[PDB]
Amino acid sequence: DNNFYSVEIGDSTFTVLKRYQNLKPIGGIVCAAYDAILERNVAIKKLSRPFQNQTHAKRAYRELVLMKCVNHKNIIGLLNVFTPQKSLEEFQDVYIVMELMDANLCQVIQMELDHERMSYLLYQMLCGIKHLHSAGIIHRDLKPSNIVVKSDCTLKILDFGLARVTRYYRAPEVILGMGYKENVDIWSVGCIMGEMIKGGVLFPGTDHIDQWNKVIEQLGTPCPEFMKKLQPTVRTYVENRPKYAGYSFEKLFPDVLFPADSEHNKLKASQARDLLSKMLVIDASKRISVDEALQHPYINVWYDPSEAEAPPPKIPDKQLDEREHTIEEWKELIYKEVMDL
Numbered sequence: 001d002n003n004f005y006s007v008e009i010g011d012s013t014f015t016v017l018k019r020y021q022n023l024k025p026i027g028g029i030v031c032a033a034y035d036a037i038l039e040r041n042v043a044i045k046k047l048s049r050p051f052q053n054q055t056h057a058k059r060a061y062r063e064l065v066l067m068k069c070v071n072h073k074n075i076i077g078l079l080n081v082f083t084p085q086k087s088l089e090e091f092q093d094v095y096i097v098m099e100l101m102d103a104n105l106c107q108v109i110q111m112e113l114d115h116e117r118m119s120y121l122l123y124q125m126l127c128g129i130k131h132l133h134s135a136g137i138i139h140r141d142l143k144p145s146n147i148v149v150k151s152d153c154t155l156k157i158l159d160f161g162l163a164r165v166t167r168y169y170r171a172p173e174v175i176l177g178m179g180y181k182e183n184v185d186i187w188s189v190g191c192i193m194g195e196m197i198k199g200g201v202l203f204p205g206t207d208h209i210d211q212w213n214k215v216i217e218q219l220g221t222p223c224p225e226f227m228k229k230l231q232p233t234v235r236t237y238v239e240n241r242p243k244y245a246g247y248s249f250e251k252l253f254p255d256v257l258f259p260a261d262s263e264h265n266k267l268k269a270s271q272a273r274d275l276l277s278k279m280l281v282i283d284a285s286k287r288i289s290v291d292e293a294l295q296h297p298y299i300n301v302w303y304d305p306s307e308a309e310a311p312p313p314k315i316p317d318k319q320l321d322e323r324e325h326t327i328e329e330w331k332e333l334i335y336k337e338v339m340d341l
């Protein structure tokens with residue numbers, strides 16, 4: 001109706017409330033817009049027919065519910081949700097309006113970051129992860145493309161991760177289809193931290209096979225104890241791989257990558273390499289926890305003991321049960337969530 005207008009963005013038609021002006025593409029398809037009612041710049045993400053299949057529906061429903069009930073400084077905040085369509089029968093598209101950030105982490109990694117900026121970004125990432133974990137959300141797919149930053153280096157996680165290709169940041173547990181726990185997300189933090197330091201992707205696998213080879217080449221063949229945690233067919237392949245010693249963390253992250261002009265910087269190089277050695281651990285049973293990572297002397301300098309801890313998200317009733325639905329049930333669930341019914 002007259003409340004909405006249409007603008008062409010890439011291959012997509014954006015039909016948005018008239019409050020949202022001067023849509024520009026960034027990086028669903030996502031636009032920056034000026035919200036004339038808030039008088040602030042916003043991001044608008046279009047979900048096209050999210051109910052059309054159960055996989056898209058589950059992810060879209062979960063994203064709507066979680067972005068609404070989650071309220072944390074390091075998780076992207078919901079401003080608005082709308083559909084241009086007037087009824088359940090005509091319902092097609094969902095628009096999620098969120099806080100506009102300046103860049104994704106991929107852009108920030110290409111800058112010549114010091115210990116101050118790196119440790120501050122990693123502290124915020126770990127804070128965001130700790131909050132998701134407290135809500136029973138284990139992400140499993142954290143990467144530079146789903147973390148955003150403002151020019152003052154404030155950081156926010158964009159989405160809530162996997163149900164239940166760029167695979168550079170996926171933990172061995174994810175790569176090899178293993179059991180996982182909360183510290184699956186520590187691997188991603190380690191990959192990003194290492195990349196910030198080295199200026200290149202740590203494990204740049206071209207496919208699933210190459211991804212595993214890049215990890216074991218750098219870090220070494222994992223212990224026999226780890227091999228017993230694999231599915232039989234996966235265990236055979238992994239054990240059949242050539243043996244690798246890997247490299248010491250001093251050889252993975254040499255001193256020349258860090259400033260060495262003071263005791264402070266010499267200490268920060270040591271602390272950075274120590275935390276890396278504890279996060280980039282193939283065997284999750286020997287890998288640092290998020291709590292331990294936050295308490296690490298590289299990271300804990302950013303902890304303010306006066307800051308009120310955000311309580312766990314109150315996910316209404318159990319509308320995030322892990323139950324499957326028909327396409328028609330998903331459509332009505334998503335529509336109700338958009339309309340507030």
Ligand SMILES: Cc1cc(NC(=O)c2cccc(NC(=O)CCCN(C)C)c2)ccc1Nc1nccc(-c2cccnc2)n1
Nearest residue numbers: 026027030043045099100101102103104106144145148158
């Ligand atoms: C304004 C803005 C700009 C961008 N810029 C880019 O995407 C960009 C620009 C240049 C180069 C690149 N390179 C790469 O990534 C390549 C990295 C390769 N390595 C992994 C090896 C990315 C990102 C987000 C925002 N702001 C914003 N705010 C709120 C929500 C959302 C949003 C976004 C996406 C989804 N949902 C919400 N975005």
